[PDB]
């Protein structure tokens, strides 16, 4: 069963650094990890805007072909809308992509993997693991 | 067969003003209109943060129940990442949701219907129409 949604920052850091602690978690949770298509979009932008687009696209494609990319669907959208509104009212917003990811993970009952605990801590109903 | 993807601006305007000319366009184009789930997120947020949330949710709900809402999927993500890269290359600002909606539409060969032509006009490969 899917259990974990990797935030974009974790993906970038893993791509750039291939860290041991992450590799261990990846292997422990093979087939239980996904990203949101919102993250895919950011990673494709990173690749295409870089000095080595072809090279970097292939690295990304290899990353995403080993996990699941989930569609940002109607329930993701609703739950994201609801969270945004709660955050506005409390004056502690989160960046636009991050809000979507948290809303997506929220709608699917998934744990967000992030090093940005301070930021993500404050999103209602969120479950977090830092794999660094 | 879907032809038009309504941008967030056109949806907000339509909801707030209930304009006669849009009603005629809608009736003529039933079952050829859609929104992105990105726009759904923005409408729910707008409802939920407003001074009459339950009431505004119901208006939003009746609006979206009458057209198709498309999931923002892997092809939408990829098309969006490409577009963001070409816009960066040209130092042209477009907002984050507008970009996703333009990528979404472009991934499905759709015309974007928008009353903010100036923002969308500089996206390469755009097809746009203004219904206001």
């Amino acid at each position: 069963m899917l259990k974990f949604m990797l935030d974009t920052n974790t993906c970038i850091f893993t791509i750039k650094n291939k860290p041991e602690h992450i590799r261990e978690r990846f292997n422990l949770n093979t087939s239980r990890m996904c990203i949101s298509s919102i993250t895919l979009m950011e990673l494709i932008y990173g690749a295409e805007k870089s000095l080595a687009p072809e090279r970097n696209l292939a690295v990304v494609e290899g990353f995403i072909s080993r996990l699941e990319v989930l569609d940002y669907d109607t329930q993701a959208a609703i739950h994201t809308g609801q969270i945004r509104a709660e955050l506005a009212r409390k004056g502690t917003p989160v960046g636009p992509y991050d809000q979507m990811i948290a809303g997506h993970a929220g709608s699917r009952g998934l744990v967000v993997v992030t090093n940005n605990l301070r930021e993500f801590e404050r999103i209602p109903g969120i479950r977090i693991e830092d794999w660094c | 067969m879907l032809k038009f993807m309504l941008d967030t601006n056109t949806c907000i305007f339509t909801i707030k003003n209930k304009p006669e000319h849009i009603r005629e366009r809608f009736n003529l184009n039933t079952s050829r209109m859609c929104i992105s789930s990105i726009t759904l997120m923005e409408l729910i947020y707008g409802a939920e943060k407003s001074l009459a949330p339950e009431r505004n949710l119901a208006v939003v709900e009746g609006f979206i129940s009458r057209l198709e809402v498309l999931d923002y999927d892997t092809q939408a993500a990829i098309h969006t990442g490409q577009i963001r890269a070409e816009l960066a290359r040209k130092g042209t600002p477009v907002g984050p949701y507008d970009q996703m909606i333009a990528g979404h539409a472009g991934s499905r060969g759709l015309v974007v219907v928008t009353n903010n032509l100036r923002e969308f006009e500089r996206i390469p490969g755009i097809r746009i129409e203004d219904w206001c």
């Binding site: 750039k16 990846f26 870089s50 000095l51 690295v59 080993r66 | -």
Partner: peptide
């Protein structure tokens, strides 16, 4: 029996991204 993709180690051990790749993320 759980379906699995290619191994994670084969990716982690692959040659990676160029140095400039997303040195910044760019979230508005």
């Amino acid at each position: 029996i759980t379906p699995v993709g290619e191994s994670w180690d084969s990716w982690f051990d692959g040659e990676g991204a160029s140095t400039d790749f997303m040195s910044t993320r760019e979230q508005p």
